Paper text:
In this work we have determined the structure of [name], a S. typhimurium SPI-2 T3SS effector protein that inhibits the NF-κB signaling pathway. In this work we determined the structure of [name] and showed that it is a hydrolase with a papain-like fold and a catalytic triad composed of Cys-73, His-162, and Asp-182. Structurally, [name] can be classified as belonging to the CA clan of cysteine proteases that contains papain and related proteases (MEROPS peptidase database). Although [name] is highly conserved among different serovars of [name], serovars Typhimurium and Enteritidis differ in containing an arginine or glycine, respectively, at residue 161 near the active site.
After unsuccessful crystallization of wild-type [name], we obtained crystals of [name] in which its predicted surface cysteines were mutated (SpvDC37S/C122S/C160S/C170S, hereafter referred to as SpvD4CS), and these diffracted to 1.5 Å resolution. Subsequent structure determination revealed that [name] adopts an α+β fold with a total of 7 α-helices, 6 β-strands, and a short stretch of 310 helix. Its central core is composed of a β-sheet formed by four antiparallel β-strands (β3–6) surrounded by five α-helices (α3–7). Additionally, there is a smaller β-sheet (β1–2) surrounded by α-helices 1–5. Close inspection of a shallow groove on the protein surface between helices α4/α5, strand β4, and the β5-α7 loop revealed a potential hydrolase active site including a catalytic triad of cysteine (Cys-73), histidine (His-162), and aspartic acid (Asp-182). The position of the superimposed five C-terminal amino acids of ubiquitin (RLRGG) is unobstructed in the SpvD4CS/G161/C73A variant (right), whereas in SpvD4CS/[name], binding would be impeded by the side chain of Arg-161, which restricts access to the active site (left). Therefore, the Arg-161 side chain could have an inhibitory steric or regulatory role in the activity of [name]. Despite being less active in the DUB-GloTM assay, SpvDA154/[name] was the most active [name] variant in the Ub-AML deconjugation assay. The fact that the SpvDR161 variant is present in all Salmonella serovars except Enteritidis, Bovismorbificans, and Abortus-equi is intriguing. It is possible that SpvDR161 has gained a different substrate specificity that is not related to NF-κB signaling.
Residue numbers in the entry: 8 to 39, 45 to 63, 72 to 94, 103 to 212
Amino acid sequence: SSQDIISRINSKNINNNDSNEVKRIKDALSIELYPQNLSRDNLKQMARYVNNCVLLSACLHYNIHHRQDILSSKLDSAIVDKIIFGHELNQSYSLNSIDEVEKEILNRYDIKRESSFIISAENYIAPIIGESRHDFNAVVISEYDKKPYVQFIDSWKTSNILPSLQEIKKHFSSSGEFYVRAYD
Ligand code: NA
């Protein structure tokens, strides 16, 4: 798979309107197992390893999928997805709150055991700039004899890379859509 990334990122079959973006990605991206059942501490180490929020979140998603620390950073999510995964990842319908994101993810896990997702928020409050598009990650953690829970992961937000639901909710007002996507 990582060799397919290398082929895509260096290819000449690219619309020149996308050239600078692909170059920014190529410049940032580095290419170098974790257990099948991840722990919260595993996720912390993976989030630290990878660290632009769209690139970071896609890198982390990829690493989680392969259970290995492969991609890191040293942007249109469609272009990023095409490079890292080889296609755009299919999205959910728009969701209206981070609470609803959590519920949808728990439902997907309940039915299909799908456990790792990229979240795209429209009106995330970033420092200084305010409401803005922001990507981050969510993984379902299953600890012994405990109900599965959603761990949000924001590898960009280095002050708190594993926020609680309460903490991440601080970064939203009622303004905003959310979308969930995942590599299959
Ligand atoms: Na926070």
